[PDB]
């Protein structure tokens, strides 16, 4: 029949081209090296290496939310990051309240450093809450713009009455006393009730005191009394919508009420912060497990061979062959007109194990079993004649399944199989040329060888952008309490509004309660 005739024809062709393959040791490997780059490398610059912008600055001169789907394809030279597309989760307004006292005297206690500034916090919060536009075209008051929140997560019963709920999300030190100035005045341990929920050890999540103060802990510690400083906090406003007129009016009203001398804050740009999806170690264990499985598989594919000259050479060559084949294929997928957007990181080991090494491995056995001792073209000829139709059937069997695999409707499986077919064909070509040339040169070489002023309020460029000195889990912790996610979205941070308070030391003496010199709280490890 035709089967034996076809076998004879293909064996004759294999024998004929084996001599040609062995005839050019250097030219063929040079061709392979040139083609490996030429086919795929120039377009490998286009994919993103992985780094990208996480903070985006937008001028406050004219701001509008970015379009969500105005363009089917985003412009190439556009500066807007891929996440800066939709509306932000919320706009965060910080009101940094620094303060100072008239000439310091010895009668002031440590509790005064907390009592004097926090006393005005309730009045400031009341002014912010009751502020309204007397002449407006759009919004009028804080109610129409504030991000309303209903209730906290279940299991956070301990934080009830210490965080806002059923109202606008407004954070201030007055939340410790529920914005009740009478309660704050009657409280006999201000530092104690401030540090009531302070953890005894370091915690990744943001502390309740840190959340309510909105300030890094170095500006609000008890140790400031030694340096004659004063506690500074921040009233945090969370905005569901943006209204330039209302924000400007609020800033102007605060500046009128509490003017801040020698203040030159720029208030020029918004800041957009995008939070990525944090991947835990739970999703990582299968990844490293399959990587080590791949390493074990390649190690077991090797170590089953014996070389006339080397002991690891052609094994390394086969590993390089498969790696370069897959690297060529992942790039040529773009030229094929198919989407290369697959993750790849977890695809790589399964792709390698699917490609396999049987075809390359079986080629070496007959070649090293060739009885010719001197001639190299001979050894190539008999070894390749022996291996004829064998690698062909192995490759055909390994590739036939992939067509049925991608004949289904699954998109990810289809992409995997489209990668696999081109990887297998590139592997076939590369083992047909580079591996046979390197084993030919190995065979060739084998036979050849054988006084004491209180510091004044300053508004330098460090007070601005103070949010970036907070804990990296500050904002996600705050929003998670209200069942709001930032995993796929971003937030916008408005410039801080400075507020400066002048305080009278005689006020602390007049309001000096008994037993003010003692408190249960004590700074741990400091």
């Amino acid at each position, epitope marked *: 029949t035709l089967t034996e005739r076809l076998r004879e024809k293909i064996s004759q062709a294999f024998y004929n081209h084996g001599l040609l393959c062995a005839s050019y040791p250097i030219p063929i490997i040079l061709f392979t090296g040139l083609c490996i780059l030429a086919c795929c490398y120039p377009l490998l610059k286009l994919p993103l290496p992985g780094t990208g912008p996480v903070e985006f600055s937008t001028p406050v001169k004219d701001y509008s939310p970015p379009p969500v789907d105005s363009d089917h394809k985003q412009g190439e030279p556009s500066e807007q990051p891929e996440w800066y597309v939709g509306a932000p989760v919320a706009y965060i307004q910080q009101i940094f309240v620094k303060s100072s006292v008239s000439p310091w005297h010895k009668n002031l206690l440590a509790v005064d450093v907390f009592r004097l500034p926090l006393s005005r916090a309730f009045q400031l919060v009341e002014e912010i809450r009751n502020h309204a*536009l*007397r*002449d407006s*075209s*759009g919004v009028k008051s804080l109610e129409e713009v504030c991000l309303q929140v209903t209730d906290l997560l279940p299991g956070l019963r301990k934080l009830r009455n210490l965080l806002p709920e059923h109202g606008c999300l407004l954070l201030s030190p007055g939340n410790f006393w529920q914005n009740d100035w009478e309660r704050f005045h009657a409280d006999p341990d201000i530092i104690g009730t401030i540090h009531q929920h302070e953890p005894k050890t370091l915690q990744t999540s943001a502390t309740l005191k840190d959340l309510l103060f909105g300030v890094p802990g170095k500006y609000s510690g008890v140790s400031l009394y030694t340096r004659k400083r004063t506690v500074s906090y921040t009233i945090t406003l969370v905005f569901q919508r943006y209204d330039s*007129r209302f924000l*400007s*009016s609020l800033r*102007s*009203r605060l500046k*009128l009420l509490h003017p801040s001398p020698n203040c030159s804050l720029r208030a020029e740009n918004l800041v957009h912060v995008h939070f990525k999806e944090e991947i835990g170690i739970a999703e990582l264990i299968p990844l490293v497990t399959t990587y080590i499985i791949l390493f074990a598989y390649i190690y077991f594919s090797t170590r089953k061979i014996d070389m006339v000259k080397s002991k690891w050479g052609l094994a390394l060559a086969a590993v390089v062959t498969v790696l370069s084949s897959l690297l060529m294929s992942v790039g040529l997928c773009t030229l094929f007109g198919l989407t290369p957007t697959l993750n790849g990181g977890e695809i790589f080991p399964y792709l390698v194990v699917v490609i396999g090494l049987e075809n390359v491995l079986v080629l070496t056995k007959s070649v090293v079993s060739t009885p010719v001792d001197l001639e190299v073209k001979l050894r190539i000829a008999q070894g390749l004649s022996s291996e004829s139709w064998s690698i062909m059937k192995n490759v055909a069997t390994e590739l036939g399944i992939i067509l049925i695999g991608y004949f289904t409707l699954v998109p990810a499986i289809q992409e995997f199989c489209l990668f696999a077919v081109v990887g297998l064909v590139s592997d076939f070509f590369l083992q047909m040329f580079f591996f046979t040339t390197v084993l030919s040169i190995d065979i060739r070489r084998m036979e050849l060888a054988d006084d004491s002023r209180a510091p004044e309020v300053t508004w330098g460029p460090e007070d601005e952008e103070l949010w970036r000195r907070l804990s990296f889990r500050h904002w996600p912790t705050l929003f998670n309490y209200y069942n709001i996610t930032l995993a796929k979205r971003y937030i916008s941070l408005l410039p801080v509004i400075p507020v400066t308070l002048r305080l009278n030391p005689q006020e602390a003496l007049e309001g000096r309660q008994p037993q003010d010199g003692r408190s249960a709280w004590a700074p741990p490890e400091s």
Partner: antibody
Amino acid sequence: EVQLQQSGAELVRPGASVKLSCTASGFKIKDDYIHWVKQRPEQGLEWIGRIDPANGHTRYAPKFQDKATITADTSSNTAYLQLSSLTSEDTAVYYCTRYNDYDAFYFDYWGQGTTLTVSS
Amino acid sequence: DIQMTQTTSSLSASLGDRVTISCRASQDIRNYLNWYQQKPDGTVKLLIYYTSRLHSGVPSRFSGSGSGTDYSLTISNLEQEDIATYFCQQTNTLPWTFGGGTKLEIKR
């Protein structure tokens, strides 16, 4: 640097309508509101109304709710005040004004004022 | 609805003297009172806003004070260029109302 140039003096028989104009130089009218103030020789200054050019929202005093209408055009950077059914009580100087701060609400920059006279 | 009243329609004063101008609001306006100076040429300029804040470019010669319903404007030394008429405007209730205005002059 910031100027609000106004039109010339006007003389119109009673019963007609007058459309005074205000051109802003040095800034874009989208940023701030535009106001119109009427000053009779002895009755003192009076507030007519204002318009938000970026939105078109207008508000007037109860006296001028029906007498006066205020419109603006962002492209030409001008604002217009129109008086309907002119009567002898309308002989006054009209000032075009904006404000910068949105809590103090102070009329920082004023126009030169256009004298308007109505008579037979 | 709020009416501002300047009882002293004319306030004769000499050059180099300190001059005070006061207007009374019908009700409390919460320190929202601005002062405007209108030259005889007809131009109008803003002197003081909120209740005592000096506008940009206004000389420190002008100052203001007051609270509740009583407010005042003071001139350190009356200059020739300061001979004009002054109005006080309230910005507490939306229909902004101006004062009756007072005119300065030199003694004869």
